[PDB]
Amino acid sequence: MKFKKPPINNPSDDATIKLAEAAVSVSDSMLEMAKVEKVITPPSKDNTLTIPNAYNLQARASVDWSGPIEELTARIAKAAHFRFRVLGKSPSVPVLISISTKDESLAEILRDIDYQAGKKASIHVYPNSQVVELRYAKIY
Amino acid sequence: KFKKPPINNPSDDATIKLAEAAVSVSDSMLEMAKVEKVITPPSKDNTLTIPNAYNLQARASVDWSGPIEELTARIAKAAHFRFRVLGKSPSVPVLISISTKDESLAEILRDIDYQAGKKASIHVYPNSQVVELRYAK
Amino acid sequence: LNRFRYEGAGVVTGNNLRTSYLDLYLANEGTTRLAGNIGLQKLEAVGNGVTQINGVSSRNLQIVLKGDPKVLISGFVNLRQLDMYGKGTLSLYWIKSDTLTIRAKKAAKIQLAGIVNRLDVELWDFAQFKGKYLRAQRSFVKTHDKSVAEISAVNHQSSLATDASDIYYYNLSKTRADFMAFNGSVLDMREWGQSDLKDFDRYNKQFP
Amino acid sequence: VPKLPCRVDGACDATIIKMMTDLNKKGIKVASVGQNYLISIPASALFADQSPRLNWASYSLLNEIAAFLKQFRKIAITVTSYSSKYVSVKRERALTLARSRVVSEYLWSQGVDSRIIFTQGLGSDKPITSYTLGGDRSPNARVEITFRRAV
Amino acid sequence: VPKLPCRVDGACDATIIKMMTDLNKKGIKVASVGQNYLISIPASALFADQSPRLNWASYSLLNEIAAFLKQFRKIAITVTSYSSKYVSVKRERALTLARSRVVSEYLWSQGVDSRIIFTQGLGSDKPITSYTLGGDRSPNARVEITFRRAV
Amino acid sequence: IIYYIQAVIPGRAWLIGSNGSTLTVREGSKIPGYGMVKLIDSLQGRILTSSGQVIKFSQ
Amino acid sequence: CFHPPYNNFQPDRRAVKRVGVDTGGGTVGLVASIYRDSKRKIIRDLQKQDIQYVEYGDTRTLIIPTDKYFMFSSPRLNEICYPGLNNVIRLLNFYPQSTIYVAGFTDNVGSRSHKRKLSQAQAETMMTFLWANGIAAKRLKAEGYGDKNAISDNAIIHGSAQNRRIEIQWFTS
């Protein structure tokens, strides 16, 4: 005849509690900023057009990286049996990307890394030539 | 018989809230960047393509920094192609640098043009085996 | 022009006949050719014969089989229920139906296409169902030993296979759930080299 | 020095060689050349017949393999699946890819000390021995994991 | 400790569960999910037949239910009165309304702690059991009290 | 008016538009607002028009 | 004997092992089997597990912690807690006629569309499992909500933890 609400868990920590309390508000602010940015600026294009996928590319990967992008992309191309090409010169400031995901397409991996690089870097793929080329932006 | 649970997994409510917030902010920033980014189709991508000439499929290892016209002339001479320039030399020259070991002549020229940007262009002719360096005005 | 029943190795041909409902009962090599739009709901082929109909636009229709005929039908039909127990071989060109309930026992070779709101299928043994080119919202698949079914669910998929059973999904559903008992297998076999094939997302990345 | 790490956490070469020897005596193929290591497992001891379903008891072997892998430091681990010709090329390739996906997912869920995991399947395209009298019982059908020891 | 109250005054979870068990074994329905509490009482055991009057012995039950309610912190409490189809709809609605008003008045008079008390009666507008043989004896003739314990 | 495919059979198909008007499309036939179909695909949902436009499945 | 992964969706012979171990008596085996298969023992073992059972009026409802019985932040389903599902099936076998409703609930953090989609996915998965448990699809209907109606507040950590859940209702006639 005892009583028990369902969720019974391990003991928690007050510091983590406060962290989550701040984090949820931070997420709320980010969400509303994204909403207003989307509503004010009309998106136009997708990177699928400039780089689609093909065969010998649906092989899958799960990675966790917290460093520069060139060696990571080189390892990607080595796995994909595709040539690696560089355009421009890397700037003095290193370009770092932290990306953590799990088991998506290699094509989508390339798409998201290109998106996260944004202005500084750009990625293109020529399947006919089986080549992956990354270019640094010409700025200043 | 011996099945294991995930080790580094959110077994606590604080942990799950933290991870959920992390997922939310990650997705938000991802789509923010997607909105921010600008891309161009290959149709209007004004970049020197591959001249697909056999005589330009050679192999060299070259490092250089400095002007561009002299380097292009040397490359053309190595390629047994005539070389010409159309325009004037700006008082401040156009400087570039590149070091590589295995990169054939065509992609070398493509990289040269990309690093030269919009101040000049380069054009190839396999009908009459020539290369033209055109300045900008 | 209301009910026709024939048996005994006979060839009949007709076209441009118009009716609300007629009852067709064919048997023993009914070489029946139709080249018109016929309104009907009840057809029954005994089996071991060839039959083709070119154009039927009926609100409803129900059909069952006992022998092993070879049936090909064109038109638009809102069918609901169907069971097979022999060596059925059927092709239907188009269907616009909301509820489909299909049972197959001994041998079935069914090629169908159209738009379906809800579909459920039970397979017992030696049944191949090529439900490709047929899109549905809700799909329920239950397959016992030695049953091959390819499906093209769009939104919601539920699939269960006992053993030596093949469930071949040729679409990326929004939500999908699959189960194998002894040797059942659920496989994508999509284009796999498609230019613009979308991949899994958080809502749908269900590991088999 | 006492504040400095004396050794890698939870490292014991005696334990490492003992566990790898246990794997080899159980029948799992372990090969070490240079510093690149290959481990091969028969399909018949892992899955059911030509199916992407997991044998319940195989979780013990999976856990043991994960524990052994934990003893090493790496960067990337590559997983490949291979089968025998049963229906087509497409069905076999899909099955191999699915097996790779499930094993990789379980490994990543486990406390694997990895940075990159690659997964792929090749169906029945690359054999290892012309002897193919059996089907899923034939040794050619296999799952292989390759990795290079870091530093 | 003698200055700052270590616990809310006159509270004991053991007493809370004891009185909940006593109510349940008496037969009056008590339940809660999350932090929302709902208690149902049959109309027959409280009122007289088809009348908005309180049986004298029911005062002890009301006293102890108020005592139980005193072991909580709340803001809003809602009371509803449901009955059986007897003659009309208007008469039954009036009967339920009067019953709810009376019970709410007595609860407020007693030492309960709330900021808002809502009361309403409907009659036989929504039963909770297909069995509709009896009248006041039917279990659907009920009075319901609902609230949420906050912080 | 925009159009989106519904189902595909080898050779011909069945099509819908923005106004909800059904249509049957031959391998060679005129499609309003798109021109004439030059090629259809069954393994892929792409179908090609004379004007060079391509039609796919509706999202 | 038995197989942990749902025993390949086949109801086991719970009585035969009991009677075998008793004979290794028939009467004590029978009484032990019927006692431990009584509905009261089912509910008690559910309460021992992380299950909430409610019966009132005529409708009956079940509450399941999605976080506990699911792989985190995924439509993926946990497997370690199989006995809960086994007992769920054993209990639900008692009502082979009631119509069933199943609903999902999640917390208030994230995109509204994201929450709705996750709730719908969880409901779809659960109803699919129920259908595979031998129940005719005519008897099932699934739905998911986000923060549409919370029995607990989100501003409190433990309350928000309680908020996300799986709800199952079914009538009697």
Side-chain angles (χ1 to χ4, degrees), chain C residues 49-70:
Chain C
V50 290
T51 303
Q52 171 183 354
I53 302 179
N54 192 327
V56 167
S57 304
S58 66
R59 177 262 129 183
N60 194 330
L61 183 107
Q62 189 58 35
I63 162 71
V64 78
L65 294 182
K66 44 205 167 305
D68 310 326
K70 324 93 192 173

Side-chain angles (χ1 to χ4, degrees), chain D residues 16 30-39 68-69 71-78 144-151:
Chain D
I16 294 181
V30 180
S32 164
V33 43
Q35 298 79 15
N36 304 73
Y37 303 159
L38 324 87
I39 291 183
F68 164 84
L69 167 67
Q71 279 298 332
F72 292 157
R73 183 179 309 186
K74 66 233 59 61
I75 285 185
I77 302 177
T78 306
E144 175 57 44
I145 47 174
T146 156
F147 91 100
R148 175 51 182 251
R149 177 176 181 173
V151 184

Side-chain angles (χ1 to χ4, degrees), chain E residues 24-59:
Chain E
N24 295 332
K25 70 175 304 304
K26 282 296 193 63
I28 268 61
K29 195 59 176 184
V30 178
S32 193
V33 282
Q35 53 268 32
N36 306 337
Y37 297 78
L38 296 98
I39 296 183
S40 177
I41 301 92
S44 298
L46 178 52
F47 298 90
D49 199 318
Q50 283 289 340
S51 58
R53 191 207 62 87
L54 294 177
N55 315 328
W56 187 273
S58 57
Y59 270 146

